[PDB]
């Protein structure tokens, strides 16, 4: 049903007397490889718990990617903070040309052919979020049509 790809795990630190106090952050993508993906960032005392928490968050926060034969309906650029993502549609055979973060989200969304480019800050967390937004912003001819009618 749903696949799980862990984008990254990190061990942040906070301060109290005595010393440091670690916590863990996990970015996990979930997808059906058929037009449905979700992103999740969960933090917890232990990695495992963090990942799970992430996965869990990933399932709420899903996006309906309008695939068109393995590709996107059209090109789009989205900025999330100082991170920018460029998604460009492509013909078959092309593949998923992208950085680890975008591809992970792209493949689980069931995208198989696409041209990608990370601009600005390449902070994984924000680059991932920029991506979700990009997809979320994708429109279909039928959609545009629906909008332009009235």
């Amino acid at each position: 049903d749903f696949e799980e790809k862990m984008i990254l795990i990190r061990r942040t630190a906070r301060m109290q007397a005595g010393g440091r106090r670690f916590r863990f952050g996990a970015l996990v993508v979930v997808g059906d490889r058929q037009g449905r993906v979700g992103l999740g960032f969960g933090k917890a005392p232990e990695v495992p718990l963090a990942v799970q928490k992430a996965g869990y968050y990933a399932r709420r926060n899903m996006v309906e990617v309008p695939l068109q034969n393995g590709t996107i309906p059209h090109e789009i650029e989205v900025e999330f903070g100082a991170s920018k993502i460029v998604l460009k549609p492509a013909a078959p055979g092309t593949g998923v040309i992208a950085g680890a973060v975008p591809r992970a989200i792209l493949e689980l969304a069931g995208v198989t052919d696409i041209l990608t480019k990370e601009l600005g800050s390449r902070n994984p967390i924000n680059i991932a979020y920029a991506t979700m937004e990009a997809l979320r912003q994708l429109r279909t001819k039928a959609d545009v049509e629906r909008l332009r009618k009235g």
Binding site: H74, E75, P89, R139, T140, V144, R148, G150
Partner: protein
């Protein structure tokens, strides 16, 4: 003084839409009027009409949006998501029929001004002509 009346109109529209106005006036000019024709026919704006305000000729542009939405922030989606000026005073931009751009795999448009009149990128392509690439809308 307005340095770019077209850019002004484009923004007036961009601005009004971001706060969901009904209409929005813009000082009238045939050329602006021409662009509105396209905008209307393409279905980005409900329509527009000439109007006199304070004695001066303007153009009510009736905008249109999508339907109310679910969850937090019910504000409707924009029909005109993007509308950017291309050619500008001091940096004019032209294109031959062979160089007319394909705005968002067609889900969008580009209004050029050709000696055969103001046309969408598709219309121009058809009559096989190019010109000043005025703006792009989607």
């Amino acid at each position: 003084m307005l340095t770019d009346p077209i850019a002004d109109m484009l923004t007036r529209i961009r601005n009004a839409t971001r706060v969901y106005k009904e209409s929005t006036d813009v000082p009238a000019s045939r050329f602006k009027e021409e662009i509105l024709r396209i905008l209307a026919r393409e279905g980005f704006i409900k329509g527009y009409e000439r109007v006199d305000v304070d004695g001066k000729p303007y153009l009510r542009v009736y905008l249109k949006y999508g339907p109310r939405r679910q969850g937090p922030d019910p504000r409707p989606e924009q029909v005109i998501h993007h509308i950017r000026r291309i050619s500008k005073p001091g940096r004019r931009v032209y294109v031959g029929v062979k160089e007319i751009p394909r705005v968002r795999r067609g889900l969008g448009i580009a209004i050029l001004s050709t000696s055969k009149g103001v046309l969408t990128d598709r219309e121009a392509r058809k009559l096989g002509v190019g010109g000043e690439l005025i703006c792009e809308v989607w």
